[model samples]
Target: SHMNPPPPETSNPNKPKRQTNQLQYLLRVVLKTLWKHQFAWPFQQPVDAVKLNLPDYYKIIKTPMDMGTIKKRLENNYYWNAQECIQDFNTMFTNCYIYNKPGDDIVLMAEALEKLFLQKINELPTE
Candidate 1:
């Protein structure tokens, strides 16, 4: 039988807020769901749909830059008001991390990025 646990008698004491990337959390959930259902499809891995006859991906995005440069830029401009750039960077990083080598420190990178936002958010004055 499933039952909701009783609510805490008193609000938990204030504690240091840890940083996290909710977007990555959502992505992880989605990937786990996909892996769970991967066997449902006859082919576990789908073939590349793009044909060489079409315009090459490199032609559009130019050469893929080193990940180190990307990270440095993010740290250099963490508080920039450009919402679009921030969103794009997070999205790009998340995509790269989704399919990474085993034992890669993907989550650690996600936490580090999220710290930028979390530090600001936690500084707000308490009511």
Candidate 2:
């Protein structure tokens, strides 16, 4: 069955031009890092595959990172914003060595996510 795709931007003609720089920056980051991080995935992605594997929670988390733990940190009474999110992610990358008996390759994972985030930011219109 076919589904309707999202509507094209009719409201702004100037949007993409404004967005080019940031989006470009983000895309470069996401694509490179995600490609590198595939080895850490529960099922290793094919060598030539361009897309990141997005398995359901059970596949990736072996012993899942608790939602309550993340939520508690998110509510840590500091000014939590996207920057904090980035910082927290970087910190997570740094500490993956400590979190697991055989540590995951979190740096690659973080880089991939960074790239994905930038891609979305790039795709959005200026408005």
| lDDT by candidate, in order shown | 0.34, 0.35
Candidate 1 ranges with C-alpha deviation above 4 Å: 1-81, 101-103, 121-127
Each prediction's RMSD over C-alphas, in Å, is: 19.2, 13.9
TM-score, every prediction:
0.27, 0.26
Candidate 1 CA-lDDT value: 0.34
lDDT tens per residue, model 2, 2-121: 222232122333433232432333334432344345433421221111232233322333332221223333333221233433443344333433443442454455445545645544
17-98 per-residue lDDT for model 1 (tens digits): 2223532332234223322442322112211124223233233332232223333333333323333233544554454345
- The all-Cα superposition gives candidate 2 an RMSD in Å to the true structure of 13.9
Lowest summed lDDT across 10 adjacent residues in model 1 is found at: 40-49
Instruction: Give lDDT: candidate 1, residue 25.
Output: 30
Query: What residue runs in model 2 are displaced by over 4 Å at the alpha carbon?
Result: 1-72, 75-79, 96-107, 120-127
